[PDB]
Amino acid sequence: XXASLXXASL
Secondary structure (H helix, E strand, O other), X not given: XXXXXXXXXX
16 A cells, blocks of 8 residues: 555555
8 A cells, every 4th residue: 555655565
């Protein structure tokens, strides 16, 4: 759930 920052899957 990092959204635009990275960590897409978190």
